[PDB]
Design a protein around this ligand. Sequence first.
Ligand SMILES: [N+]
Ligand SMILES: [N+]
Lengths: 126, 122
Amino acid sequence: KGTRFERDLLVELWKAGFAAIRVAGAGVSPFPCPDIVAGNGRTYLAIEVKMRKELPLYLSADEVEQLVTFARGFGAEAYVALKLPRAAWRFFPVQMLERTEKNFKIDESVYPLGLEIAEVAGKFFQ
Amino acid sequence: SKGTRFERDLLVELWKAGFAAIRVAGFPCPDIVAGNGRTYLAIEVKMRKELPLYLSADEVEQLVTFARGFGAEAYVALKLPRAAWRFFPVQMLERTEKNFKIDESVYPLGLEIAEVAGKFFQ
Ligand SMILES: [N+]
Ligand SMILES: [N+]
């Protein structure tokens, strides 16, 4: 299911004009790395991919820090892509995430602010 | 297998050269994608005990298509034993009948990693 959904996201990214790839060993890697990397020549994305049955999404500080470090080194924008059962993929720039004392979270107050993929690509033209 | 071994070696050399780099899992796709904030690379990774390297037209076409879409420079990276990694822009590949190749006449033209990164080497 998950790889179907992560491939699902890759397919959506390509339909949106990105060339995108899933990262191999994105878990057991010594280096900072996202789950997906995408680019269209203008916009470059480093994406951590999450699926939840319901809100909220919690992420660790480490996972987010590693994402940001990768994105800064690569020359990409750091995003969390979150899928809920009935929803299309929704994209959250890291700044949109809410801080708890220890973790980061997307709950119901933030989820509606998330972006569709076309909005992510459109930011370049403002 | 060894394929992965050489891909992992290159990932380490890319990070050391100032690129953030990833290996690609599994829609044309290269083996490695890297970037340093200004240059982006799409790399097909090969190891041979001896020259020449032959590549299919399809593999090269997919690399080019991905690199065009992504906004990256397309390279074939080739490791021989006891030699540093060398990097060949697709334009440097010799076209054959239906394939592409790197033989002893093309190999010395290949870039080293410092030249790809546009940096100094110690
Ligand atoms: N586009
Ligand atoms: N090939």
